[PDB]
Design a protein around this ligand. Structure first.
Ligand SMILES: C[C@H](Nc1nccc(-c2c(-c3ccc(F)cc3)c(=O)n(C3CCNCC3)n2C)n1)c1ccccc1
Length: 338
């Protein structure tokens, strides 16, 4: 084991190994906190995340295990992955803190180039999100909360997806209507909806469906895509949902060409295929990557899929000490990248 050093940051103590220097708080909240650090053993700059109260409850302990398993699994350029994972703990018995390490990214999509993002910037960014989603979706993982603050980018416009599979600017703004209005049954194209919303925003400078609550939000969405016809209305189980929607007079579906007016017509068509209510008819990430709007970036030989990922743990009901020991084991078996 390495040599650690302790230190208190933003009223947050940190006990990390010597290899990481110049810790400097970058972000925080409920989840825990993140510091930018310099990693002396490889010359690279990293982000160190200390989980907040990793084993305070069964739900905490399970989410901790969930995050570590997710992160150890993802190996892709457009998906945050694991450089290192460590604990001060010298034994299972002492184990109470988890720190996760990944390459440092510059900012998130809220605050990063132009005011007018430019259509080629748009192309590259959305291309990278779709390529990351492709990988993720291929492991039967779904983001569920995809949005600009979960998309990290570099000054070079390199992009990585953050916080995927954890939700087991405003979130509601980018959420697919089917999971928004509670649906246990949807598919991975919920994340494509969000992509749609993000893409629109970039191109346009304004949030596509702002919305002050779930009702205002759904109203804003039907205005653009139009009320569900009888074809889609057949797949809505709840009288509840079906009565409200059938309760509002039909809204026609708008001409996207006129909403996003003078955007690249290729952009608009793609927007048209992503922002469909029927989640059965919504384009998937692998299909979107083959749309013409990305002819300049698309490369079928370099848009890999994930190895199979075992989330059998997810239906497991265990005690905190079982989740905690599961997590400790994953720390101990961690193999850094080559
Ligand atoms: C400067 C900082 N750089 C950075 N780099 C890489 C990963 C990160 C990073 C991580 C993170 C850090 C280390 C890991 F091993 C895994 C993930 C993380 O969990 N977040 C937030 C995601 C939203 N939920 C709260 C935590 N961020 C921003 N941060 C940053 C701060 C804010 C936005 C984007 C980037």
């Amino acid at each position: 084991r390495p040599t650690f050093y302790r230190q208190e940051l933003n009223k947050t103590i940190w006990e990390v190994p010597e290899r990481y220097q110049n810790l400097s708080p970058v972000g925080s909240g409920a989840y825990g906190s993140v510091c930018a650090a310099f990693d002396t053993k490889t010359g690279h700059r990293v982000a160190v995340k200390k989980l907040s109260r990793p084993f305070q409850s069964i739900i905490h302990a399970k989410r901790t295990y969930r995050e570590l398993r997710l992160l150890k699994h993802m190996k892709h350029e457009n998906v945050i992955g694991l450089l290192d994972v460590f604990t001060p703990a010298r034994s299972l018995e002492e184990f109470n803190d988890v720190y996760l390490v990944t390459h440092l990214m510059g900012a998130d999509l809220n605050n990063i180039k132009c005011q007018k993002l430019t259509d080629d910037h748009v192309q590259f960014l959305i291309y990278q999100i779709l390529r990351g989603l492709k990988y993720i979706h291929s492991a039967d993982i779904i983001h569920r909360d995809l949005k600009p603050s979960n998309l990290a980018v570099n000054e070079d416009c390199e992009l990585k997806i953050l916080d995927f599979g954890l939700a087991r600017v405003a979130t509601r703004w980018y959420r697919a209507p089917e999971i928004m209005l509670n649906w246990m049954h949807y598919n991975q194209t919920v994340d494509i909806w969000s992509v749609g919303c993000i893409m629109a925003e970039l191109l346009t400078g304004r949030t596509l469906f702002p919305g002050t609550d779930h009702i205002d939000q759904l109203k804003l969405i039907l205005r653009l895509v139009g009320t569900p016809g009888a074809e889609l209305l057949k797949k809505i189980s709840s009288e509840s949902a079906r009565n409200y929607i059938q309760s509002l007079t039909q809204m026609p579906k708008m001409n996207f060409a006129n909403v996003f007016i003078g955007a690249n017509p290729l952009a608009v068509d793609l927007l048209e295929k992503m922002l469909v209510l029927d989640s059965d008819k919504r384009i998937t990430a692998a299909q979107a990557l083959a749309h013409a709007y990305f002819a300049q970036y698309h490369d079928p030989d370099d848009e890999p899929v994930a190895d199979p990922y075992d989330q059998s743990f997810e239906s497991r009901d265990l005690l905190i000490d079982e989740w905690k020991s599961l997590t400790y084991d994953e720390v101990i078996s961690f193999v850094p990248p080559p």
